[PDB]
RNA sequence: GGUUCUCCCCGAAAGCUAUUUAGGUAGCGCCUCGUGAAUUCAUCUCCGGGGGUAGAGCACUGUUUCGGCAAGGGGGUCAUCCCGACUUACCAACCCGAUGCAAACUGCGAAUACCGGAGAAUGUUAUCACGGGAGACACACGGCGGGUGCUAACGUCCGUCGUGAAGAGGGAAACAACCCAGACCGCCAGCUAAGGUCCCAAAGUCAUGGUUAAGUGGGAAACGAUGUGGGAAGGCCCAGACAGCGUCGAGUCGGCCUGCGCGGAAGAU
RNA sequence: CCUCCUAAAGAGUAACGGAGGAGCACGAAGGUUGGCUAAUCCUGGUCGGACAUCAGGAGGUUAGUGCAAUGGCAUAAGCCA
RNA sequence: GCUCAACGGAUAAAAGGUACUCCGGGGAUAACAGGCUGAUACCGCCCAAGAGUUCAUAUCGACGGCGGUGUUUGGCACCUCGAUGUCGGCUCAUCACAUCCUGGGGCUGAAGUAGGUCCCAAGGGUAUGGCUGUUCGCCAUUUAAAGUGGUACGCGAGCUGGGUUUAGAACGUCGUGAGACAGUUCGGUCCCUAUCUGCCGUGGGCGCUGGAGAACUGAGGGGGGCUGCUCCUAGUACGAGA
RNA sequence: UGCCUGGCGGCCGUAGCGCGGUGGUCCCACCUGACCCCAUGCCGAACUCAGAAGUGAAACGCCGUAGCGCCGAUGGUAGUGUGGGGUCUCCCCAUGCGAGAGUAGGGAACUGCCAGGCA
């Protein structure tokens, strides 16, 4: 899976309730000895993709910034009654 | 129909039923009968839904209720004036907020699933969906 | 009809009087309590209704101190 | 119940406490007049504080479901002097792992608020004390947080803010309490607020792009439905799909999310 | 009159709101000095059993507090002299 | 030395009745009606366990769910206590439609006849008596049918006054008693000459463009709109017959 | 100046448990006896005293080790002050504040004074 996203200029709760009305959401990758990287990712994109069981077990790439970072899913959190990605935690593999 | 077989107090405050749900995955079973809307479930609404699951799975797989009714709702009889004390407690609610998974159920196709919890929606007061267990 | 309830105490007026900083003269109250929700610390007497009052003038500074961590009221004189 | 001339300045309360008190009264709170005194007070910023609310959580107090483990305990044969041994539609504590719930749960914990300190600016001292004079102690609605009630009431009882009360003007058809806004007087000047600009009726029959066909707009839910718009993604398809009768030559199928409509929808001049 | 909650994390805050208590006790159950540490369960043990006392261990206040509830309490405010 | 416990403690020292009543007040506060509300009530609807030989959905609808009405029982105490006359009847109504009859129609577990159920429909129509103050109800006998509601539970400045609710009296019952009872019993004053609105009738004035006498047109308004039975069609269609 | 031990503090779990080592010269501990001082609601167990043959067994200290306890970002979520809005039992928008839980990860404390042993 390759997933593209952009470094979230704004965070906070404001900003990322304005992703979501843009369907998009907030993710972030953290992980090794680099600094966290807030990003933002697709929100139907994602959504289709983690549909498979596969996303959440196989090193994932996230094309950010045009850099390829591995990750893997560590966690998500679904919007709590609809369809939905609220935000994903990526771990740096 | 479930009630707490004892409790500290028997009468309580209104309340409010703000938020949203905590238990909002398919922790137990394969598939998941989800609050959308809020509100409350009585013990009454719980059995009946739950008959007619159950009654629709011919008693085959696995039920779970993830909801308990442990609120006690208090009435006023007919023809008495306000005050003078609580009324009595007349039946026991669960406060749902919207993504409480409120049933549950493993060991059928997800068709007779899908079934069972339509007929169960029916008796409820809460607009509901259909969930399936993630992977995360 | 009736009801067996409809009694109530009078409220004690209880709690923090002088908070942190606060310039107090010697024999001022601090904090009314019931037990040793604070304890006496420097310059702190702790009375028979566990009220703590200032034994120096000075400056009430709270602190968190010792191996239960227990909040303890002091007089900075 | 009624209380008679005029103008100017300020301007409440409908609370607490007590009361053979509850539509009375007293002290205090709030008003006024006078006197006197500190950057005295307020806003903001920064600094020092305590907190256990919201939220959260489940170690505790309780409650709760599922699974595992199983001390024991019923239900019953074979045995039966004393015993034992298999055995359960079985009912099952503790403990362990999962899931929730709490005004009178808390191994967590905000925002605010409050207390104190410091510093500017600003404010008719806005502060405090003392003294002369009161009035008031039936409140109402609205917002927010709640108890009660049916999260019924233009209901009731608190907290807190706003307005009415004691406040005109503009808006909400009309409409104390909502929205805008605080009327010293005069003007046949001008700009705006809320709210508006087709006619009644002042101002766009304004511009651009969409949606709706229901007069929806301009009352009403579960739920029902090839209404119609948008978005993402599929299944199958010129190795001929889908529908109709191998033929037939182009798409078809029904879930998902979403905008606006439709039915559901019966009342008395 | 007391305690808790309602009570909106300072104080205070209503209802014929939700729950309980008081109208005492004690010359020690007060003072001080010195000392001490709970419940509960497991294993073993005359009578003795689910539970008496004894021994060891687990446990760590889940006890205790003259009497409600809350807040306290090991330096104990608990227990003994 | 105080259960001065009504606990800021009127006295050292204190219970009741009044329908024989009275005054000052209050819509600050109840009874009626209105209002707000809609728990309750009534009426719809959703799901479909099941009943219905078989068959959820002809008919019915368990467990539950969602509404509508204002419509019962209530809640509240906003209007009225310097008075908003009350149950029932009589007289006269008027509207709604959730339709009782008559009209139209779909489904039927509708052969016919006759039903059941739902939809449309408010034009008109829609009992008399016995008992009881009754409304209601039961009963008798009619009818095509004897609708359900709203209208201050329509209507006392229109009538009645049997009921309720003054003063008299009695019974049962309670009370030592005065007296009392949403227990019973017998008796027991119902005022108003209509100013305004409204309505039914009926004139006067002026207008309508010179005046006058007639006949009209018809904007608009009102009235009316019910229905039985018999016979024929035909003992036909239908039916095994009945 | 290093290493070890004792005492007294700071600090109050990143510091506590468990589990595997390990130390006796000194120190510490157990230890050895008790007419004594003092002691046991009985008991030299403890407390106390007189001691130094023995052992680090226990304890204690030290070291190692994540199975726990503990600590813990980032991001998101919840809540919320002010202003505004909706379909107003509940939410949403602007702005400010922003948890709890969980995640990555951290983590087998650190440190002052004095005394003694050793090097
Ligand atoms: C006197 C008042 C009356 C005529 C009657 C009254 O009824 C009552 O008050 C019942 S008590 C009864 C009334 C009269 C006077 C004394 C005695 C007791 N009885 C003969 C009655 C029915 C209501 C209950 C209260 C309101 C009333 C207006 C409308 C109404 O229905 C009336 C009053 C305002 C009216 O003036
Ligand atoms: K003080
Ligand atoms: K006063
Ligand atoms: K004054
Ligand atoms: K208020
Ligand atoms: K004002
Ligand atoms: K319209
Ligand atoms: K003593
Ligand atoms: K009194
Ligand atoms: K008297
Ligand atoms: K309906
Ligand atoms: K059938
Ligand atoms: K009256
Ligand atoms: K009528
Ligand atoms: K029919
Ligand atoms: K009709
Ligand atoms: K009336
Ligand atoms: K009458
Ligand atoms: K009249
Ligand atoms: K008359
Ligand atoms: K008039
Ligand atoms: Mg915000
Ligand atoms: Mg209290
Ligand atoms: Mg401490
Ligand atoms: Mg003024
Ligand atoms: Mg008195
Ligand atoms: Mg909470
Ligand atoms: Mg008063
Ligand atoms: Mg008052
Ligand atoms: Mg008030
Ligand atoms: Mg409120
Ligand atoms: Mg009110
Ligand atoms: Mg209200
Ligand atoms: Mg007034
Ligand atoms: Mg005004
Ligand atoms: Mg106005
Ligand atoms: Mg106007
Ligand atoms: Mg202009
Ligand atoms: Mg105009
Ligand atoms: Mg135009
Ligand atoms: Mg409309
Ligand atoms: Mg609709
Ligand atoms: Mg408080
Ligand atoms: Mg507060
Ligand atoms: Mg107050
Ligand atoms: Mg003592
Ligand atoms: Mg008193
Ligand atoms: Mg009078
Ligand atoms: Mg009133
Ligand atoms: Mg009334
Ligand atoms: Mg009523
Ligand atoms: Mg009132
Ligand atoms: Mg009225
Ligand atoms: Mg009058
Ligand atoms: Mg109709
Ligand atoms: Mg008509
Ligand atoms: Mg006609
Ligand atoms: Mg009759
Ligand atoms: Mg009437
Ligand atoms: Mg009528
Ligand atoms: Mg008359
Ligand atoms: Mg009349
Ligand atoms: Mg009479
Ligand atoms: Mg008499
Ligand atoms: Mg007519
Ligand atoms: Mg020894
Ligand atoms: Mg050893
Ligand atoms: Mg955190
Ligand atoms: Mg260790």
Redesign the pocket.
């Given at each position: 899976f390759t997933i593209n996203a952009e470094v979230?200029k704004e965070?906070?709760?404001?900003?990322?309730?304005?992703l979501?009305?843009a369907?998009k959401f907030?993710?972030?990758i953290?992980?090794?000895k680099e600094?966290?990287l807030?990003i933002e990712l697709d929100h139907?994109?994602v959504?289709?993709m983690q549909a498979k069981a596969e996303f959440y077990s196989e090193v994932l790439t996230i094309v950010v910034d045009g850099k390829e970072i591995k990750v893997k899913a560590?966690?998500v959190?679904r919007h709590p009654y609809?369809?939905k990605l609220?935000?994903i935690?990526f771990?740096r593999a | 129909?479930?009630?707490?077989?004892?409790?500290?107090?028997?009468?309580?405050?209104?309340?409010?039923?703000?938020?949203?749900?905590?238990?909002?995955?398919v922790?137990?079973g394969s598939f998941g009968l989800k609050a959308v809307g809020?509100?409350?479930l009585?013990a009454?609404?719980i059995?009946?839904?739950r008959?007619?699951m159950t009654?629709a799975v011919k008693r085959q797989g696995?039920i779970?209720?993830?909801?308990?009714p442990?609120?006690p709702?208090?009435?006023?009889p007919?023809?008495?004036?306000?005050?003078?004390?609580?009324?009595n407690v007349e039946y026991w609610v669960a406060?749902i907020?919207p993504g409480?998974?409120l049933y549950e159920m493993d060991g059928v196709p997800e068709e007779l699933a899908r079934e069972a919890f339509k007929?169960a929606?029916?008796?409820?007061?809460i607009?509901?969906?259909f969930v399936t267990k993630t992977v995360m | 009809?009736?009801?067996?309830?409809?009694?109530?105490?009078?409220?004690?007026?209880?709690?923090?009087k002088?908070?942190?900083?606060?310039?107090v003269l010697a024999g001022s109250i601090i904090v009314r309590?019931?037990?040793?929700?604070?304890?006496a610390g420097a310059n702190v007497g702790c009375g028979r209704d566990?009220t703590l009052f200032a034994k120096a003038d000075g400056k009430?500074?709270?602190?968190?101190?010792?191996?239960?961590?227990?909040?303890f009221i002091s007089i900075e004189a």
């Open positions: 979230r965070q906070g709760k404001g900003a990322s309730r304005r979501r009305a369907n907030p993710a972030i953290y992980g090794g600094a966290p807030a139907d994109k959504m289709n560590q966690d959190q609809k369809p609220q935000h935690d771990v | 129909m479930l009630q707490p077989k004892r409790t500290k107090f028997r009468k309580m405050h209104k309340g409010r039923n703000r938020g949203l749900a905590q238990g909002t995955d922790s137990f809020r509100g409350r009585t009454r609404q059995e009946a839904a008959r007619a009654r696995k779970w209720i993830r909801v308990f442990d609120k709702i208090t009435e006023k007919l023809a008495v004036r306000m005050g003078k004390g609580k009324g406060l907020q409480k998974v007929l929606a029916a008796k409820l007061p607009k509901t969906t | 009809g009736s009801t067996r309830n409809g009694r109530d105490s009078e409220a004690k007026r209880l709690g923090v002088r908070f942190g900083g606060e310039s309590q019931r037990g040793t929700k604070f304890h566990h009430v500074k709270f602190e968190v101190k010792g191996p239960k961590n227990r909040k």
